[PDB]
């Protein structure tokens, strides 16, 4: 009810301040769903045209091999040789790989879950780069300027997969497995162009139920690594989630829209056809407790030292936290302290 995905329509004035807007959507309860859609003002555009990127190199395209049955699957990401956007699009749009005919989303979603183990598609995933023009100042994924910037501030080391933008060139049936962000951070995803991207979300207050369910389904993966979901290989159909009483919601992201994922917000999804999305991680003051308590991959990976954040934002707790006495319990319903001005 209050864990349902929400869509926001900021005005141009409201859009200019990223962090303030994030605070605003949390004061509205957006974080409870674990995922929110943000439709930018009509006048806003991050790039004049996308007709000048055909020679853009996808260095490590991945063939997505999926094995499984009865709504439970494991995705094996097979590296293919480098290719350009032009070559990628030719494959995406060919008879062999293009989107099937469909009337309603529910029909396309059925095709996805029935055919994800067949005819493995190629995902032009994790390409370092941005499609934003240099002068765009609003919601610029390249430079959000959140408190996540503090790691680079004190050491200069940029952790690969954190605080840098990534591009994802999708084709029909390419997917992202169930996961939460690295260090349980926030994430932003903008669909630059093409066919939609469909998303599934589990509210952070029900995240441990999803983990317990995936542990029961893959006991071998769980014994090897407690945090095996962080490998981003596990696919679980909505039918299985429904059967085992895991609450979830679904949303389709169209070209020109943003998706925000919240700390400990489990999400998965798939691309409807040839498209391109830009993404990065970011943080608010609320994330600090999430980063301290993040259950990380012990086999295996992205790790951020919390010491800098605790020392700056929670110095009274520093000694208690460094001694293993920080017994703090996270309340997933509470908005970020920055949202106080809206409540
Ligand atoms: C380090 N790599 C990013 C990790 C990462 C974190 N969030 N996230 C995603 N989150 C949301 C949406 C998407 C999406 O549409 N498409 C791809 N990845 C998405 C992907 C690993 C990796 C990327 C893609 C993939 F398939 C499998 C592994
Ligand atoms: Zn993600
Ligand atoms: Zn692991």
Resolution in units of Å: 2.1
Which residue has the least CA distance to atom 14 on ligand 1? 176
CB atoms within 10 A of CB 2: 10
Rounded (10°) CA dihedral 283, 286, 288, 293: -120
For 109, the enclosing helix (H) or strand (E) is helix 105-115
Catalytic site residue from 71, 87, 179, 226: 179
CA 90 to chain centre: 26
Catalytic site residue from 279, 289, 291, 332: 279
Is residue 181 among the annotated active site residues?
Answer: yes
Nearest partner of 60 among 135, 158, 155, 127, judged by Cα: 127
Catalytic site residue from 26, 109, 181, 338: 181
Q: Say yes or no: CB of residue 125 within 6 Å of ligand 1.
A: yes
Handedness of CA 145, 151, 156, 160 (dihedral sign): negative
Could you tell me how many helices (H) and strands (E) the chain has, helices first?
Answer: 11, 16
Determine the distance separating the centroid of ligand 2 and the alpha carbon of 77, expressed in angstroms: 16
Q: 297: annotated binding-site residue? A: yes
Ligand with smallest separation from the Cα of 263:
2
- The Cα diameter of the chain in Å comes to 62
CA 214 to chain centre: 19
Percentages helix, strand, coil for the chain (3-state, rounded to 5) are: 30, 25, 45
Q: 192: annotated binding-site residue? A: no
State the first-to-last Cα distance of the chain, in angstroms, to the nearest integer. 20
CA 71 – CA 65 distance, rounded (Å): 15
Q: Which residue has the tokens 């996540």?
A: 148
Residue 20 structure tokens: 């303030």
Beta-strand relationship, 197-202 and 266-271: antiparallel
Q: Say yes or no: CB of residue 229 within 6 Å of ligand 1.
A: no
CB atoms within 10 A of CB 247: 17
Which residue has the least CA distance to atom 1 on ligand 1? 161
CB atoms within 10 A of CB 223: 10
Which residue has the least CA distance to atom 21 on ligand 1? 126
Is residue 291 among the annotated active site residues?
Answer: no
Residue 219 structure tokens: 């006991």
CA 236 – CA 74 distance, rounded (Å): 9
CA 77 – CA 82 distance, rounded (Å): 15
Which residue has the least CA distance to atom 9 on ligand 1? 176
Q: 181: annotated binding-site residue? A: yes
Do residues 170 and 269 make contact, with C-beta atoms less than 8 angstroms apart? no
Residue 343 structure tokens: 């409540």
Do residues 8 and 25 make contact, with C-beta atoms less than 8 angstroms apart? yes
CB atoms within 10 A of CB 77: 17
The domains found in the chain, sorted by start residue, are 5-343 (2.60.120.650)
Nearest partner of 119 among 77, 160, 172, judged by Cα: 172
How far is residue 159 from each of residues 132, 163, 208, 304, measured CA to CA in Å? Answer: 21, 8, 27, 8
């Amino acid at each position: 009810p209050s864990a349902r995905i929400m869509t926001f329509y900021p005005t141009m004035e409201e859009f200019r301040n990223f962090s303030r807007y994030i605070a605003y959507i949390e004061s509205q309860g957006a974080h409870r769903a674990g995922l929110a859609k943000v439709v930018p003002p009509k006048e806003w555009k991050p790039r004049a045209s996308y007709d000048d990127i055909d020679d853009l190199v996808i260095p490590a395209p991945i063939q997505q091999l999926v094995t499984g049955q009865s709504g439970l699957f494991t995705q094996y990401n097979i590296q293919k040789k480098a290719m350009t956007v032009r070559e990628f699009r030719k494959i995406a749009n060919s008879d062999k790989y293009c989107t099937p005919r469909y009337s309603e989303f529910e029909e396309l979603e059925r095709k996805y879950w029935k055919n994800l183990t067949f005819n493995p598609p190629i995902y032009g995933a994790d390409v370092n780069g941005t499609l934003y023009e240099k002068h765009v100042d609003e919601w610029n994924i390249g430079r959000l300027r959140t408190i996540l910037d503090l790691v680079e501030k004190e050491s200069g080391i940029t952790i690969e997969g954190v605080n840098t933008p990534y591009l994802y060139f999708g084709m029909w049936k390419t997917s992202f497995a169930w996961h939460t962000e690295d260090m349980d951070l926030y994430s932003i995803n903008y669909l630059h162009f093409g066919e939609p991207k469909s998303w599934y979300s589990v509210p952070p207050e029900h995240g441990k139920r999803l983990e317990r369910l995936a542990k029961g389904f893959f006991p071998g993966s769980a014994q090897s690594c407690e945090a095996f979901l962080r490998h981003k290989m596990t696919l679980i159909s909505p039918l299985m989630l429904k059967k085992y009483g895991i609450p979830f919601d679904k949303v389709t992201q169209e070209a020109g829209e943003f998706m925000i994922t919240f700390p400990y917000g489990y999400h998965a999804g798939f691309n409807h056809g040839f498209n391109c999305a830009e993404s990065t991680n970011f943080a608010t003051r609320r994330w600090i407790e999430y980063g301290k308590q993040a259950v990380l991959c012990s086999c295996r990976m992205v790790k951020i030292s919390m010491d800098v954040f605790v020392r700056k934002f929670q110095p009274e707790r520093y000694k208690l936290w460094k001694a293993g006495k920080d017994n703090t319990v996270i309340d997933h319903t509470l908005p970020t302290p920055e949202a106080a001005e809206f409540l």
